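Q: Predict the assembly, please.
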Amino acid sequence: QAVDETLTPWTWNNNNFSSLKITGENPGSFGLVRSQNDNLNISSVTKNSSDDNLKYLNAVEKYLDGQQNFAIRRYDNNGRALYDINLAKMENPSTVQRGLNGEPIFDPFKGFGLTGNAPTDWNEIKGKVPVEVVQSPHSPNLYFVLLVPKVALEYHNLNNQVVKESLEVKATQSSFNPTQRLQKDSPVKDSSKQGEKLSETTASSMSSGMATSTRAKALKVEVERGSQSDSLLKNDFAKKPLKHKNSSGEVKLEAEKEFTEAWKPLLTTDQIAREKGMGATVVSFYDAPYSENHTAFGLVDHIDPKKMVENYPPSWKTPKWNHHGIWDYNARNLLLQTTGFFNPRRHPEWFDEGQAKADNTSPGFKVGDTDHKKDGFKKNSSSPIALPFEAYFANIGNMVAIGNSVFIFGGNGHATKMFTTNPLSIGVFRIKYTDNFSKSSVTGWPYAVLFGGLINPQTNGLKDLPLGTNRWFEYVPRMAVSGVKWVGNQLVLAGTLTMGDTATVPRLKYDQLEKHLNLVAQGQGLLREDLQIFTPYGWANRPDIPVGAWLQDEMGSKFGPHYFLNNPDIQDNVNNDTVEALISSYKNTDKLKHVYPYRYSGLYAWQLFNWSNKLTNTPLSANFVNENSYAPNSLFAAILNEDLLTGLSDKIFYGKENEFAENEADRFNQLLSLNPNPNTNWARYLNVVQRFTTGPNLDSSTFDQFLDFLPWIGNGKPFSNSPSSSTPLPTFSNINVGVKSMITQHLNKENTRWV
Amino acid sequence: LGTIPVLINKSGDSNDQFNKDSEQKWDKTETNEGNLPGFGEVNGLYNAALLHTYGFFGTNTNSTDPKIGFKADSSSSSSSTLVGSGLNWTSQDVGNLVVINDTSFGFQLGGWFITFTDFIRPRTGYLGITLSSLQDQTIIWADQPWTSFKGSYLDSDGTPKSLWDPTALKSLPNSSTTYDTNPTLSPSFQLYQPNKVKAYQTTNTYNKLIEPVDATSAATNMTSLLKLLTTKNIKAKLGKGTASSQGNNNGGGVSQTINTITTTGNISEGLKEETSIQAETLKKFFDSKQNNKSEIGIGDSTFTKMDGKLTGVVSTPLVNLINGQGATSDSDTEKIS
Amino acid sequence: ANTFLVKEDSKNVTAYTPFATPITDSKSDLVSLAQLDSSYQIADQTIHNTNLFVLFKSRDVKVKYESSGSNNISFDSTSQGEKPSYVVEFTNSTNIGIKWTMVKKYQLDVPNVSSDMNQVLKNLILEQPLTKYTLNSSLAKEKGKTQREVHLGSGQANQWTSQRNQHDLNNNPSPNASTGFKLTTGNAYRKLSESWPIYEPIDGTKQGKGKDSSGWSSTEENEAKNDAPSVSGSSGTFNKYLNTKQALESIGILFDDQTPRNVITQLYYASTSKLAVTNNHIVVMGNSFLPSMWYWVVERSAQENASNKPTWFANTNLDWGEDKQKQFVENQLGYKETTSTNSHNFHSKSFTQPAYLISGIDSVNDQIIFSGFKAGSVGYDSSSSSSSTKDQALAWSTTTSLDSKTGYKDLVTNDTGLNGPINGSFSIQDTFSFVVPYSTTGPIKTAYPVKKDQKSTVKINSLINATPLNSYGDEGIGVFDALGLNYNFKSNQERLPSRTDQIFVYGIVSPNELRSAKSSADSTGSDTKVNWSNTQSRYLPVPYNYSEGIIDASVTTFSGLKSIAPDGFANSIANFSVGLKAGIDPNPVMSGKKANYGAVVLTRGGVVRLNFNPGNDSLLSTTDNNIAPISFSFTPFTAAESAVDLTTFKEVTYNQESGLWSYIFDSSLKPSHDGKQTPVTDNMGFSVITVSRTGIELNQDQATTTLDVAPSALAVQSGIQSTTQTLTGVLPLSEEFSAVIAKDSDQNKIDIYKNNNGLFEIDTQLSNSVATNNGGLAPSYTENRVDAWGKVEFADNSVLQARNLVDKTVDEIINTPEILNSFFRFTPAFEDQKATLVATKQSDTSLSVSPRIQFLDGNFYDLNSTIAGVPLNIGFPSRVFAGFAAL
Ligand SMILES: CC(=O)N[C@H]1[C@H]([C@H](O)[C@H](O)CO)O[C@@](OC[C@H]2O[C@@H](O[C@H]3[C@H](O)[C@@H](O)CO[C@@H]3CO)[C@H](O)[C@@H](O)[C@H]2O)(C(=O)O)C[C@@H]1O
Ligand SMILES: [K+]
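A: Predicted assembly structure:
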């Protein structure tokens, strides 16, 4: 009960909490404290080869219960300690007694009435450590605290052969070489299947056009359902005249032949939900500084992973698949990349089997059979997105309270991060109270649906950032979270955020991988880098040409009229007489589409402007999404609807409006948007953000001027280089680089003099 | 965070060196003597300028020339790789959100404190951001640097503040123990691959895109660069890797953001246009202010030392307590009972 | 009036209490009371200074147009179709209950027609009305002649540069710009004396007869009929033609059996749809469904048995924002010339924009606000004989060029397309655009596509479209014009407006302005004109995300554009607007400034805010012409508001306490049958959209006298909706609560919806509490229950002795309301519901107390409360306390 001076205050790395300021009727502080003692040899808890992690983690918690003490003492308004609150050790623990209207029975000098019995699950809460504390905005003397297993603090002090990196260091006995891990060999035309390519348009409709040319025509693509029980009648997007290399066996993503001791979670999402001692907990409690009965508990809630994972969007059951489907799946697998939008080859932190499922196989859809008409149907999934131990504690921390409810926005991830492993906050939990605080409820939702209302009007920074989405939640935003607080009247969020993947929107020609090793390694999970890299000489004409169309100039002797290398100077001129042969005739239908005999080309900005998940002026608009970031690559802060965050229902209901197409005939005429069904409610959650910000309130090259103005912390020198013949040049801005000249000779040779 | 990578052909090792002088021509960007890569470079920026700002060649960052860099040659086929900046910070190194008044708020992000002062009420001619940088070389050149940050808080004199302790750092998961650890798994390490590239044209060098070649055996020609992938080997060649860094041996204590007024971040003479392009008039407006950044809201955080360990803070609406010490008799209230 | 009026049907208005109960005997057949026959129905109604103003129109109405004589428009007296529409003023004669009695009755007569007017009307032709079931491809019309075919001819664009000076087309880079669209195929066009068909073509590019009246009825009408036969419970194939007869009846088209009545009749019947009332005037305007060509300003002073005359819109000059914007519209109305003969159109006879699709109409202070869409009007060559543009409409994109100096003023005053075609397709370098890249020997000249040779002998007559598009031509610029998809390539990408297609129009009209209009309408002999100088226009396209699969980066045109339109329309190209409503901000303004007011109106994909300056009753402007007229703001709908079927709009209320607009949609308004004659089965239920204001409003503090950012609005689908119940009425009791009255089967039921942080949800316990009235006007009181009146427990009498209040007298206690709040403990049924005790002296030694309790509407009720003067007799208790002293 009374104060013990042997426990000293500390800051947790994952949320940076250490104290709460109490406000209103009796001010003061609560703060975290721990025992001062050194020589914490956790490696003495020996791990055998013949058993799983759970009995080891329970032995580490039992060891830490002996080796350390933790508590949450109260202080007065000047910082004098009042009472100790070591939750593992305090005398006569009880819940608070209630009147028939749910109110706690109280009188300030006596304190609260105690029932004389502890809350539910007391036999497994007593081992947990408290890590964040908050106060009710509307109810007097009422507080909330968040608790975790002590391994969520000690994770980096556990022994290194179980708390591994996602990549091995190796013994380097043959000397080191970074090319030995990379799957690298490029695909080739099939020696026994050359003829299944797209057909050339034998006659093309006039459409009241007039001009003509000698060049080869556009290529037809057709899809239709037929009458057969398990096959289409046509499916030209599912053609496969390319195949992988043989180099002492076939080159492919095949985890069991690469990962000899595959990296895996400390616990799976279905373990943490059922092993009630390993899940995080929130409790309500009551406190008064000068009473006889100064402190007692309210109610206990589990921050259950299933209350987050069962609220993932329907597509997160099949993270190896996306709404473009068969052609995009094949083009990614041919380039040895991650298929879908979230697979574990890049993102193992959210999967219960970690690296052991780092493959493109069995994506929840029928693919790779002997006939293009037989591929392209929905089936059972091989691996859904989960919430395993490492991602779970990155989704814990950063609390706030609003009305009769309290929240958890997740941490920065420094609970569970490793040098090749990037767990993050992927959303928000809420805990809600009912029957005048007699009862409670718990839920959570991902940022992917909560950010769905973002549009270009909602920021004073730059426009068109890779933050857009559509009717399928295949864009997956996640954050290292700085916190949530009241800025005067406004509720505000801050941190760092994942964009969509900007490094792989431009795409390679199929054969050239052996001269582009970094650009494939950056897609392979071997290089975990999100920065954009200059590589234009090896890109194809468009990111979205289907794999059946590519093999139209294997010699390069026609400069590939339908598909060739991205050089900007040798683009086909549409002029105005040219269009009738190359586009101004090839009309599409409800079963027929075309690939044009036109040499498209352009540099990195034109690639992103066409195929990035850019923001726009209206929500759910972004039909193109590439892939999701390794790590946070944006600043982020936002203003929230605190009312709507209080008003939204506990359970999100999705429906068939968020499902991928069941077969490819529904993919050919695929609906871009739909109204919510009568039973569903997902569209209500889109609007929790009012406004957001990302950097300086500057436009165009002016922003590159700010990038040049700030000092580099390693030497105190600005990247602009101007504060001291043969002087050096700046890096970000173009001012004083090279020479001035007039743009009057460029492109159209017009408007430049005045506009 | 200071962790943009740079592209390299050449290390500080014997006969592998690249020079600040007689090997780079800033006045002649039309030819290979300007050393622009044309392949494998980070988008939007320029590599040789970034190498100069890092000081990988010349006496800019160290008491003698480290001789690390990139060169374009017309005599032979050549090899390169990306390498790190020498810094180990990362974008997950974000600390406490703190609110200063009814409209202004900020947070710690690695070696910086950042403030979003105008987000609730924007204005014309204001850039909307302020930034304060840490100075301590013992923190900035550490191997796991964010572990030295002890928390950030609002203080009752009207400023945000933070705590640091140079005694809090620890070694990597192993000390190499018995073998030459070239791939030291660490927060700025990556498995960067060889890029192999054809000879540059001696004149009219950039009239066409630069052409890469089969890199699948290229690693044998570039073993010095493969050793330079680990940040500790970059720091060693920059003279930062050991006690040659100097400064305070201990020196934990308190850090504070720069002073501010209603004029701070007003750049209205660098904003808008009437003669030229807006970045160029902002560049003119910045050039006379390179030695006076604090009125732009850009600068270094002030710092004071403390005795003993820093473990954390606890906070009240009147006072902040360090390790739980700093309380007072409340002398203005003694006579009331 | 402490009541809500509910239109139970086409004839009956019943008054409801805040307890969602009818006031007894209040239910009144306003048709019968207006001494109108059983063919009349209520179109619109409004309260002004506590009297009820009703607009009635007749299903029996028959109008005629005879091109000769000159009382050209008249009612058809023969049979029984002399059935003009009436406005009627009713007053409540009783102070207990509701006895509506008739005060003033005004007939809405047919327009006078001048000579100049009747020459345009002779050959005026009108497009068949757009419906629910009209497709992008139904609208689409066959592409007309190129500018260089019209002029030079069959022949070459190798001579385009030698020749364009000899036809006033100097420096014109657009030999292939379209001069418009063919009237031999598509949507039926018809004169005032003809009838539209019940059949709409699926591909109007192929399947219509357009203005080919004679061709329709001898060939293509039998095809349409055999392909698309009316139901008869038949069923057919609908390969070439939808059959929209029931969708037609739905939007107010009238019928002798299976044939619609003449155009002039449907014009009149639509024209008398909406009303508004000021101290001096009744104004009457048309619906959002047909174009209207006239409106009424009735002088409320008008003698008892008079014939109030409508003012033509062709005689009503608006300010479109800048003179150029007027010229754009007037240039494309038709060919003007002193040189031509019998070639008469609105432009050639010096009329202005002749027709609007009106959103609706309201009054604030003594001001009429209106808004709507410019109904497309263009010239068409009705020539007979080798006329190249024969049977062709003369229309062109007027969309601002790429090089246009940016900033609004510049954009809308750009000389691009001003006098003729300029827009088509352009492949500069390798960057496709439909819009001219620039607008050098000298400056670019545009000309009207009637070749100099035929200038004397040509016949260009006026038509009106069914929609806000001028140009139906099946080229790619038409889609981009209609969808808002033309953009510049500068360092901002500001969107390039049209000034002829998709043009929204609003204003505020002063009582002097309504006075000219009445003057135009009474004008002896010639056409008198009216200037309305408090108006603006705005390019307001339908949203591009209400379509799919548009090509960029076989260009997509109207005949191939794919609709995904969620808002109850097949088509995704023609904008629509409905339920304009004004309202006074309740939010205080700085003293010595007058109360703020706005209006809002729904359009496809968003709510529009109109903003006013109460100071001089003007549109809000700001000094800069760079920022765009600050009188208008557009806030786009989310998925939830986009999903509401806008063709089901029933009514819009504004509440001055909440400062909130309620838009009621009733799905019982859907037609019985599809265009394929399939029974329509989602005709059950209703929906409410709540509009609020957003931004910094005028005159908060010294800073907000000046504004350079337009205030806007926000439409939220509130949560009050149903796909099961039949609506009677929605009573917006308060910001926190709405009462819905509905039938599940056939009896009325009361649901209460409670606002939870911006989202309304049913409260089943409060619904049951409110609905338990036991046949009374208000919810029961039960002592032992937290009901609609909360719960009141009285102190025991023994409290007086314990607290020494026996030493206080009755008069002391009775004048000490804080003492007598200590005589009960109150449990609210909803948060912040309040209650007090009213005290009454009973003897020297004793008093009684009786609770005064707030209901859902924020109002206090007690034993003596009335609605409409009728005691509610709710049943609050009384409680004696006794033992107080006499001093
Ligand atoms: C909307 C429109 O008509 N655009 C036309 C453009 C436009 O004027 C420019 O792009 C603006 O910079 O002009 C085009 O034509 C110019 C050339 O025409 C050639 O003649 C062709 C003709 O173009 C074709 O329609 C039919 O065959 C003719 C040959 O018999 C001339 O030989 C050449 O010198 C140019 O004048 C263009 O952009 O090419 C046509 C566009 O439709
Ligand atoms: K009661």
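Chain A touches chain B through 130 residues (CB under 8 Å). Residues 53-67 of chain A form the longest helix (15 residues).
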